[PDB]
Amino acid sequence: STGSATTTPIDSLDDAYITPVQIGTPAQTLNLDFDTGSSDLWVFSSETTASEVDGQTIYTPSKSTTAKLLSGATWSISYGDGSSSSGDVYTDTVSVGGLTVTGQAVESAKKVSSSFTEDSTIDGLLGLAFSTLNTVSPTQQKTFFDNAKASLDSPVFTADLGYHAPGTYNFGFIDTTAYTGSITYTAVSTKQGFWEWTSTGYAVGSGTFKSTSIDGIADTGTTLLYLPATVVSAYWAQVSGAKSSSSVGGYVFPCSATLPSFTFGVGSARIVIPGDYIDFGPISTGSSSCFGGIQSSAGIGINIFGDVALKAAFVVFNGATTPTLGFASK
Numbered sequence: 001s002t003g004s005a006t007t008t009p010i011d012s013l014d015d016a017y018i019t020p021v022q023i024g025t026p027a028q029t030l031n032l033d034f035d036t037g038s039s040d041l042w043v044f045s046s047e048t049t050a051s052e053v054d055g056q057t058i059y060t061p062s063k064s065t066t067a068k069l070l071s072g073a074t075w076s077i078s079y080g081d082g083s084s085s086s087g088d089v090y091t092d093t094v095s096v097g098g099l100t101v102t103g104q105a106v107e108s109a110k111k112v113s114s115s116f117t118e119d120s121t122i123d124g125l126l127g128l129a130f131s132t133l134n135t136v137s138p139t140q141q142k143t144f145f146d147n148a149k150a151s152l153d154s155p156v157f158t159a160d161l162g163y164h165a166p167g168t169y170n171f172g173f174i175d176t177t178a179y180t181g182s183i184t185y186t187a188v189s190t191k192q193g194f195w196e197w198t199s200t201g202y203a204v205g206s207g208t209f210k211s212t213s214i215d216g217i218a219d220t221g222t223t224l225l226y227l228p229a230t231v232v233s234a235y236w237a238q239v240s241g242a243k244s245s246s247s248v249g250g251y252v253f254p255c256s257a258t259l260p261s262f263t264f265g266v267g268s269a270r271i272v273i274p275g276d277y278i279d280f281g282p283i284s285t286g287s288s289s290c291f292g293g294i295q296s297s298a299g300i301g302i303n304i305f306g307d308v309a310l311k312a313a314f315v316v317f318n319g320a321t322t323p324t325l326g327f328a329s330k
């Protein structure tokens with residue numbers, strides 16, 4: 001089997017992407033944030049505290065003839081950005097782009113943090129990291145991809161995120177029309193539960209490539225590119241007037257600037273992020289200070305190849321017995 005679904009930016013900045021997902025019988029379609037940095041499929045629901053729901057579409061398990069309470073199971077998650085949610089668990093039928101999994105754990109939120117409430121466009125998350133990170137207790141549950149894997153034509157999914165435009169998540173096949181040149185594959189460590197890999201270096205604009213190992217994660221659920229302070233300083237030094245602002249919480253730059261590209265290495269291959277992808281616009285409405293899309297990972301504890309980086313590539317998440325990651329230009 002295979003599946004193919006379009007993923008759409010939630011706003012004009014590509015802060016996140018949403019993908020329609022069918023849950024239950026008859027189908028209830030919710031727009032979920034596919035997150036290769038976490039491993040829980042959770043949704044706003046009829047159980048979510050009413051004051052914490054503001055415009056989201058909810059899953060109502062009582063209206064699904066295939067929903068079953070997973071008795072005694074609870075979940076609770078905290079993300080890197082400080083957001084969180086928790087609740088109980090149902091199993092139900094879940095379909096993405098024509099690919100159906102029966103008995104998928106659907107984690108129903110009883111509580112969500114303010115950031116989730118305030119984002120009316122995101123009805124929940126669909127985790128695509130390794131199932132070892134799943135938070136369900138006392139019986140850990142599998143991700144949608146892990147459940148689907150055996151049925152897929154090939155044990156892979158691909159992320160093809162758009163810049164200010166829709167893109168695609170495919171399951172079970174590699175669309176050879178969706179990228180240019182060749183896909184370069186690179187080793188993955190699953191030891192922390194992430195799609196963790198080592199970039200071979202970087203360049204800023206038309207500058208020379210610096211060969212240096214940068215360990216990090218491919219994370220579709222993180223907006224920005226978070227890299228070591230040395231690398232980030234070298235980037236922003238090429239932008240007149242750019243500075244790190246403790247009050248804003250990262251690098252900002254004059255909105256009148258033209259940003260240089262940023263290149264990262266994948267083995268002997270190179271992925272170029274155009275300068276415009278690194279512009280996240282005014283820090284507040286009407287401001288001439290703009291927020292940068294490349295930020296320091298110091299204090300996070302891990303480097304994160306988030307959407308800024310991933311959207312510049314066609315990315316293969318190869319879930320074979322020994323997982324790997326593939327990157328192609330597009």
Ligand SMILES: Cc1cc(C(=O)Nc2ccncc2)c(C)o1
Nearest residue numbers: 035079081083115116119221222
């Ligand atoms: C301000 C904000 C952040 C988020 C959000 O979804 N975080 C997040 C971070 C990492 N992985 C998954 C999710 C929301 C709704 O609002």
